[PDB]
Structures are given as structure tokens and as C-alpha cells.
Amino acid sequence: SLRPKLSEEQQRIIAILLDAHHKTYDPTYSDFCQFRPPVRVNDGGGSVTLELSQLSMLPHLADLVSYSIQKVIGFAKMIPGFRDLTSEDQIVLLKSSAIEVIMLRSNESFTMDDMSWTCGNQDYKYRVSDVTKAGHSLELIEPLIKFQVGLKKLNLHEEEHVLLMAICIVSPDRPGVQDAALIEAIQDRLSNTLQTYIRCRHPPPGSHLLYAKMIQKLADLRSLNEEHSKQYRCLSFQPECSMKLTPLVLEVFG
Numbered sequence: 001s002l003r004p005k006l007s008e009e010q011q012r013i014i015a016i017l018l019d020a021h022h023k024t025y026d027p028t029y030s031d032f033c034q035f036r037p038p039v040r041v042n043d044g045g046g047s048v049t050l051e052l053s054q055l056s057m058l059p060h061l062a063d064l065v066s067y068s069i070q071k072v073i074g075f076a077k078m079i080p081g082f083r084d085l086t087s088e089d090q091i092v093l094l095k096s097s098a099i100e101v102i103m104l105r106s107n108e109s110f111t112m113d114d115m116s117w118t119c120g121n122q123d124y125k126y127r128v129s130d131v132t133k134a135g136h137s138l139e140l141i142e143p144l145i146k147f148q149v150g151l152k153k154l155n156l157h158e159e160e161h162v163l164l165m166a167i168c169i170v171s172p173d174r175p176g177v178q179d180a181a182l183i184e185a186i187q188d189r190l191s192n193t194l195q196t197y198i199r200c201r202h203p204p205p206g207s208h209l210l211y212a213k214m215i216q217k218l219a220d221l222r223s224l225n226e227e228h229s230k231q232y233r234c235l236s237f238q239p240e241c242s243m244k245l246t247p248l249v250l251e252v253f254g
């Protein structure tokens with residue numbers, strides 16, 4: 001019912017987050033030529049044995065994810081209040097949310113035109129088959145695609161999109177966090193900003209219930225995180241896999 005106006009502080013928070021995202025997410029994907037080249041071996045059969053023997057798309061995707069983790073770290077550092085946290089808690093939050101924020105932010109390159117993450121010419125267009133060529137199984141990919149479509153259909157404003165990523169990162173319920181209270185205080189400030197923004201700036205019929213739907217996506221991400229971790233473990237058993245990854249990836253998921 002009540003639709004309070006965004007406070008000056010809440011307006012500043014949104015402005016800061018939009019700016020942080022614009023500085024850490026390049027919509028032209030111009031740095032991609034700097035990653036190890038994507039290689040797509042013939043695997044129409046989806047052979048796990050062949051996929052693991054080659055891991056043809058792993059160097060490229062590992063570089064893409066590593067690059068993205070760096071961007072997420074940069075984004076996180078700009079989240080109002082994040083700097084108030086101890087270095088130890090900052091790292092805990094970053095490592096635990098990295099893959100989740102990558103899945104969220106990737107929605108910007110995801111397209112329902114053909115259910116792919118399109119970052120340019122065919123070379124940088126990623127489909128389910130490209131992810132299997134990196135060593136992952138459909139147990140992760142299919143649910144991930146479903147998540148992308150569900151997120152797409154929420155038609156989030158960029159303001160809502162950046163707030164959701166910030167809320168995802170600043171979560172008090174991450175194993176290893178020391179000052180949960182402070183983290184929750186920061187998250188509540190972000191959550192209240194999001195709730196207020198939706199109530200006074202998001203037109204119907206895709207509003208209000210929108211907050212609940214967004215919070216539900218955060219729960220969905222936890223499941224995807226767990227599944228990705230299980231599969232990363234398997235992938236790491238492959239001899240010489242470390243060289244196909246990056247130091248940052250090895251640490252975050254190791």
C-alpha cells in the first residue's frame with residue numbers, strides 16, 4: 001500500500017551501484033580476444049570421456065570466469081558499506097558468492113533468441129554444448145539455462161539488477177563469516193533500498209510480488225553454487241587440469 005519515496009541515501013546507493021556496474025561490465029565484450037582462444041572439438045554425442053580428455057573449451061571459459069571474478073571483486077569493493085567490513089569477511093563473501101554473481105551478471109549477455117550467452121561473433125557465443133566441452137554436465141547446465149530464462153522474464157530494471165547482485169554478495173549466511181551482524185545491517189540497507197525502489201518505480205503488473213521473486217532467485221543461486229562446486233571437484237581430478245584454469249579460479253573454487 002504505502003509507497004515511501006527513495007531517501008537521498010537510497011538514491012546515492014543506487015547511483016553508486018549503477019556506476020560500479022557500468023565500470024565493471026563491458027557490454028561490448030571487447031577484452032575477449034585476450035582470453036585463450038575457444039576451441040570446439042566435434043562432440044555431437046556429448047561424450048563425457050571425450051570432453052574430459054580434451055577439455056577444449058576450458059582454457060577460454062576459465063579465462064572468461066577468472067576475468068569475471070576480477071570484475072566482481074571490483075564491483076563488490078564499490079558496494080556502499082563493503083569497505084566497512086574486515087578484510088577477512090570481505091574475502092569470505094567474495095569467494096562464496098563469486099560463481100553466483102557471475103551467473104547473475106551473465107544474464108546481461110544471455111539471450112532467449114536461441115538460449116545462449118552471446119558476447120559477439122560466433123566465436124564468443126556460448127551454448128550448452130560449449131559448457132559440456134569445458135567438463136560440466138547437464139545436471140548444472142540445464143538448471144542454469146532455466147535460471148537464466150526465469151531471471152530474464154522478471155524484466156528487471158538495471159537498478160534492480162545491480163541491487164540484487166549487491167545483496168547476493170553481502171549475505172550474512174555464508175560459512176566462515178565473522179561479523180554476521182554488520183553484514184546483515186549492510187544487506188538490510190540494500191534490501192530496503194530494493195524494496196522501496198520496486199514499490200515506487202516499478203509499474204504493474206510485474207511489480208510488488210517482484211521482490212519475493214527476486215529473493216527466490218537468490219535461493220536458486222545457492223543450489224546452482226552447490227552443484228557447480230561438486231562438478232568443479234570432478235573436473236579438478238583430470239590430470240593437467242590446473243594448467244587449463246587460472247590461479248584465481250583455482251583459489252576461489254579450490
Ligand SMILES: C=C1/C(=C\C=C2/CCC[C@]3(C)[C@@H]([C@H](C)CCCC(C)(C)O)CC[C@@H]23)C[C@@H](O)[C@H](CCCO)[C@@H]1O
Pocket residue numbers: 024025026027029058061062064065068071102103105106107108109110117119126131134136140228232249253
Ligand atoms: C562470465 C560472464 C559471461 C557469461 C557466462 C556464462 C557463459 C559460458 C559458461 C558459464 C561461464 C557458466 C559455467 C557453469 C562456469 C564454469 C567455470 C569453471 C570451468 C571454472 O567451473 C557460468 C556462467 C556462464 C559473459 C558476460 O555476461 C560477463 C563477462 C563480460 C562482462 O564483464 C559474465 O561475467
